[PDB]
DNA sequence: CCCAA
DNA sequence: CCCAA
């Protein structure tokens, strides 16, 4: 069923930020499964407890981009998220028009693994044919980015996209207003912004932007929207300017604005991908298959020189995730002679760029990690860099590797982890049970601060300690008790 | 008195966006004078009326920057602004520590004209000596911009800057919490963002950033802050990185972040101003005084070629307001032979860049505006461009010029002005009394929409129609009646 | 002096 | 095929 798959996607698969295709932003030890729709129904049915503050804060997870710029993913508190997901499920007949939006490529869709939101799920076949069909006969390409699609989207504009702005103003119940209310409750009862990473906020953004897509489609524009990025194909240059103008009016109707720095008009034919993508693939040592596995095994010189050229392209161009693309090109065609060289190169690049840290888990088995403790020092230096740069993705993945592979962590970097206080990193540290007293001191400071949003920012740590009977429930409601009684575990075993 | 000057600055001078030094963002026909502190006290004392919505929306005024990027200035509704200014005045002893912040250059200060916030009020003497003293012995200059100092500043962080974050969390009355509440009431009871242009929000931003400045000052950093832009002078490069890191932690303490695109580290000695500033002044035809007025009168070739070079510099460099700087260099040294050439050049540049539109008022007397109606067509084409580009500064200044100088406006562009619906432009159109029925239809649509924020977005138009007895008061409170009874006029005569 | 932050 | 939006 579409409805049941939507419910299980919202809670069991796309609650945590898990929208990436190949490697996740979060280590795989964190999983939102065993959090079923029945449990969320029981949470939403709970009315006990008193909150001094209105709304709920969320666990914040800082993941670096390719330019080391932090992006704040969020894990919503399960009470507010359960209510929001239940409301989205209950009115899915009125919401599912976002599925039949041909212009939006990244939208809800029934996937095999159980998700609804997967970025870049479509294959290169249909992708290539689609951009060649859209770009045919047109000599201008328009790239326009919404400035604040996650950070300043208007929750009160959720009705305005559904029934119209004027009709929603006269009408002030409808499901869109309740969706607005629950989306506000998801983040501290704040009217602006949505948590990045869950599919509920992606559904809300699709609902808001579907009216803009419909208005642009009714004017005859050929365009594709990936989340917030619009790519339009225009026969003439005034058509590009008119698309930009009409998109500006349609975004300003819902209190949104184009990123004036990011919008650009290029001459077709450009490239189907970015230019660095073709530069990398045309220089890839693994670009041709041989159908025998011994032939397509890369040597040391090939991979080392290709990664050096990738660093050259990242410095010179820097138009995207060049290093991650090249590493994913060469990481699966390695032989056992060259594992140490590529692994040390990945360690250096991952110290410089934390987004390359998860690739260390690809070759984490072949590398003799005991050795002469040099790898322990390198991993702890990576942990120091992650604590200094305040990035949660690299620290979480490195801590996952150290816990799984029994790499020892010094006390000095544990002090830096507590000073940073990333919720997922502290969840991993609590799951190791070595550092119980420091986690206890941290959560005691959070409790004695008596701020409800401070507890909400570490609800996952508090629930992981409560579920293992290491700490009482910080809240006075029954949501944590309901989740513990039905065996909800966000750090499950295999 | 400092307190009385603060009150009269907040209400009579710096209510409207009037922080610019030479030419204002708003035409001079708009003035916030005759809105005295006694009147605001009477407004804040009023408790009658009922609002379905919480908070007040504000008049939005889109002013272009040098790159034609819109910046949204705001005129706060006089009830919320009166309460906010009264609360800022009543606790000025606890607020006035922002005056004694040596690192912040643009801060409240007792000025001769009655304002407290004037950008770049200090003379070139003290400016030049200050950047030469700060840059001496240091070889690195750090430019770091706060990303959302106006658009995502946290109102609940107003107590956190005053008494500390932890103490404000335990404390949950104090004046900072009430200041937070009134600042929220200024913009639709929204916890994020401040209206740009009034000095109350500048005071709030100074309060929030003063703790960051104190923390950076206590670590021995030599730095200067202009609004949101930090410029630090460092002996070594790690000192620059450590300043960037500590500023990141101090901003993240109050839910602020650096603009990672804008931050840069340059090598001292650079230039005291920007590089294009010295390029313009070293090529300025008026750069040397002669002490006789006939000698320093620029010819046609001099000004035309200097403006052509200014357009060349704006295209090639584009690092700032190059065209406005060069125009202000040459606009006051013109002779009567060259008025037509420079005025036509300004008309072309002002069509392309609306921020140059106010300079048309410098030579608006010498130009024979009747002529053969060509200037009427040029002004109406400028009005068409302002309606299409959705800019309020250029449209407001052009409408002010047309009303003052009796330039006729066609009905076709009046349709575009109503379609744009800028509040200040419609205030000017209502003050001309020619277009009464169209303004009546517009305000009838706003009234029949029954949205309180929609009335708040055009409160200035509604009050200008109410004060001239052309329309009844849209609100049910006594604020408009109090302002009318004491003769408050935001469009006063000379 | 003449901009902007 | 292998990224990101």
Closest listed residue to residue B179, CA positions, set B108, B95, B252: B95
Helix A322-330 to helix A339-352 angle, to the nearest 10 degrees? 160
Cβ–Cβ under 8 Å, residues A193 and A151:
yes
Cα separation, A492 vs B293, whole angstroms: 85
Q: What angle do CA A356, A310, A280 make, to 5 degrees?
A: 110
- E strand segments, B11-147: 59-64, 70-75, 140-146
Residue A267: is it exposed, middle or buried by C-beta count within 10 angstroms (0-12/13-18/19+)? exposed
CB contact under 8 A, A450 and B388: no
Looking up tokens 């101003």, which residue turns up? B273
| Coil/strand/helix, residue B140 | strand
CA of A369 to nearest chain B CA: how many angstroms apart?
A: 33
**Looking at residue A355, what DSSP letter applies?**
G
Query: How many Cα atoms within 13 Å fall on the side-chain side of residue B111?
Result: 21
Q: CB-based contacts of B100: which residues, under 8 Å, 6+ apart?
A: none
Q: Is the C-beta atom of A124 closer than 7 angstroms to strand D? A: yes
Cβ–Cβ under 8 Å, residues A161 and A211:
yes
CA of A148 to nearest chain B CA: how many angstroms apart?
A: 11
Q: Is the C-beta atom of A313 closer than 7 angstroms to strand D? A: no
Cα separation, B456 vs B461, whole angstroms: 10
- The radius of gyration of chain B from alpha carbons, rounded to an integer in Å, stands at 24
| String of DSSP letters for B453-475 | HHHHTTHHHHHHHHHTTSS--SS
Residue B342: is it exposed, middle or buried by C-beta count within 10 angstroms (0-12/13-18/19+)? buried
The method of structure determination was cryo-EM
CB contact under 8 A, A388 and B166: no
Q: Mutate which of A168, A169, A258 to test chain B, going by most B C-beta atoms within 10 A?
A: A169
Cα separation, A120 vs A62, whole angstroms: 22
User: Considering only alpha carbons, which residue of chain B is nearest residue A166?
Assistant: B449
Asked if B124 reaches chain A (Cβ–Cβ under 8 Å), the answer is no
- B193 contacts on A by Cβ (under 8 Å): 192
Cα separation, A223 vs A141, whole angstroms: 9
| String of DSSP letters for A167-206 | HHHHH---HHHHHHHHHHHHTTT-SB---BSSHHHHHHHH
Q: Kind of pairing, strands B140-146 and B258-267? A: antiparallel
- At residue A150, what are phi and psi to the nearest 5 degrees? -100, -30
A-B CB pairs within 8 A amount to: 44
Identify the residues numbered 193 to 232 in chain A whose C-beta atom is closer than 7 Å to any atom of strand D.
226-229, 231
What's the token pair of residue B30? 């708009």
- Integer CA distances (angstroms), A76 to A70, A195, A198, B113, B228, in order: 19, 7, 8, 51, 31
Residues within 8 A of B (CB atoms), A 211-270 only: 245, 248, 252, 260-261
Selecting from B67, B172, B451 the residue whose C-beta is nearest the C-beta of A169 gives B451
- B261 contacts on A by Cβ (under 8 Å): 261
Cβ–Cβ under 8 Å, residues B310 and B323:
yes
Cβ–Cβ under 8 Å, residues B138 and B151:
no
Asked if A192 reaches chain B (Cβ–Cβ under 8 Å), the answer is yes
Cβ–Cβ under 8 Å, residues A419 and A387:
yes
Query: CA B252, B255, B260, B262: dihedral to nearest 10 degrees?
Result: -110
Cα separation, B442 vs A480, whole angstroms: 53
Cα separation, A29 vs A200, whole angstroms: 22
- Integer CA distances (angstroms), B202 to A394, B24, B25, B37, B44, in order: 38, 17, 16, 19, 21
Cβ–Cβ under 8 Å, residues A365 and A330:
no
Cα separation, A48 vs A30, whole angstroms: 28
Give the distance, in angstroms, between residue B226 CA and nucleotide C5 C1'.
Answer: 5
Q: Is the C-beta atom of A383 closer than 7 angstroms to strand D? A: no
What's the token pair of residue A264? 């650009």
| Helix, strand, coil % in chain B, rounded to nearest 5 | 50, 10, 40
Q: Which residue is nearest to nucleotide D3 (CA to C1')?
A: A321
What's the token pair of residue B161? 């800057």
- A390 contacts on B by Cβ (under 8 Å): 248, 252
Cα separation, B412 vs A185, whole angstroms: 47
- B260 contacts on A by Cβ (under 8 Å): 67, 69-70
Closest listed residue to residue B393, CA positions, set B434, B353, B453: B353
What is the number of other CB atoms lying within 10 angstroms of the CB of residue B318?
11
Asked if B295 reaches chain A (Cβ–Cβ under 8 Å), the answer is no
CB contact under 8 A, A260 and B390: no
Element (DSSP H or E) covering residue B262 = strand B258-267
Give the distance, in angstroms, between residue A194 CA and nucleotide D3 C1'.
Answer: 24
Give the distance, in angstroms, between residue A33 CA and nucleotide C5 C1'.
Answer: 49
Cβ–Cβ under 8 Å, residues B416 and B383:
yes
Q: Mutate which of B390, B416, B455 to test chain A, going by most A C-beta atoms within 10 A?
A: B390
Residue A440: is it exposed, middle or buried by C-beta count within 10 angstroms (0-12/13-18/19+)? middle
CB contact under 8 A, B169 and A260: no
Question: B192 - beta bridge partners?
Answer: B154
Asked if B170 reaches chain A (Cβ–Cβ under 8 Å), the answer is yes
Q: Is the C-beta atom of B229 closer than 7 angstroms to strand C? A: yes
Asked if B60 reaches chain A (Cβ–Cβ under 8 Å), the answer is no
Give the distance, in angstroms, between residue B245 CA and nucleotide C4 C1'.
Answer: 25
Q: Tell me the nt nearest to B63, Cα to C1'.
A: C4
Q: What angle do CA B492, B493, B494 make, to 5 degrees?
A: 125
Please give the resolution of this entry in Å, rounded to 1 decimal.
2.3
Closest listed residue to residue B443, CA positions, set B467, B412, B414, B421: B421
What is the number of other CB atoms lying within 10 angstroms of the CB of residue A129?
10
Cα separation, A399 vs A388, whole angstroms: 15
């Amino acid at each position: 069923d579409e409805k049941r798959h939507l419910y299980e996607a919202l809670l069991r698969h796309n609650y945590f930020p898990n929208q990436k295709g190949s490697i996740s932003e979060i280590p795989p030890c964190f999983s939102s499964r065993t959090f079923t729709p029945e449990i969320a129904e029981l949470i939403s049915s709970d009315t006990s407890g008193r909150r001094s503050l209105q709304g709920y804060d969320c666990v914040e997870y800082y993941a670096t981009r390719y330019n080391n710029f932090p992006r704040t993913l969020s894990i919503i508190h399960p009470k507010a998220y359960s209510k929001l997901a239940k409301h989205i499920h209950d009115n899915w007949e009125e919401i599912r028009f976002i599925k039949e939006n041909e212009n939006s490529m990244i939208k809800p869709d029934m996937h095999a693994d159980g998700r609804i939101i997967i970025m870049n799920y479509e294959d290169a076949e249909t992708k290539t044919i689609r951009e060649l069909n859209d770009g045919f006969g047109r000599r201008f390409k328009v790239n326009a980015d919404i400035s604040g699609c996650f950070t300043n989207i208007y929750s009160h504009s959720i009705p305005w996209a559904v029934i119209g702005v004027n009709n929603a103003k006269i009408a002030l119940k409808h499901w869109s207003d309740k969706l607005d209310y629950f989306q506000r409750q998801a983040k501290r009862n704040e009217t602006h912004g949505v948590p990045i990473g869950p599919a509920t906020s992606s559904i809300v953004c699709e609902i808001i932007l579907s009216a803009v897509d419909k208005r642009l489609r009714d004017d005859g524009f050929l365009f594709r929207r990936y989340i917030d990025d619009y790519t339009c194909y225009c026969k003439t240059h005034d058509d590009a300017k008119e698309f930009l103008h009409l998109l500006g009016m349609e975004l300003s109707k819902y209190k949104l604005s184009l990123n004036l720095h990011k919008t650009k008009i290029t001459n077709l034919p450009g490239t189907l991908n970015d230019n660095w993508v073709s530069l990398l693939n045309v220089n890839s040592p693994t670009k041709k298959r041989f159908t025998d596995q011994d032939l397509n095994k890369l040597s040391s010189s090939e991979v080392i020189n290709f990664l050096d050229y990738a660093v050259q392209l990242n410095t010179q161009v820097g138009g995207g995730s060049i290093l991650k693309y090249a590493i994913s090109l060469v990481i699966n065609n390695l032989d056992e002679y060259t594992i140490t060289q590529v692994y040390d190169y990945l360690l250096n690049l991952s110290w410089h760029y934390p987004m390359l840290i998860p690739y260390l888990g690809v070759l984490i088995e072949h590398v003799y990690l005991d050795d002469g403790d040099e790898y322990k020092n390198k991993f702890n230096e990576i942990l120091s860099m992650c604590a200094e740069n305040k990035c949660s993705d690299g620290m979480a993945w490195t801590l996952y590797f150290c816990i799984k592979n029994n790499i020892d962590i010094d006390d000095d970097v544990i002090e830096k982890i507590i000073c940073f206080g990333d919720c997922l990193s502290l969840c991993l540290l609590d799951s190791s049970d070595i550092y119980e007293e420091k986690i206890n001191n941290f959560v005691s400071d959070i409790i004695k601060l008596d701020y409800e949003y401070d507890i909400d920012r570490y609800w996952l740590l508090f629930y992981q300690r409560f579920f293992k009977d290491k700490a009482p429930s910080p809240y006075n409601d029954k949501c944590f008790d309901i989740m513990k009684g039905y065996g909800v575990d966000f750090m499950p075993d295999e």
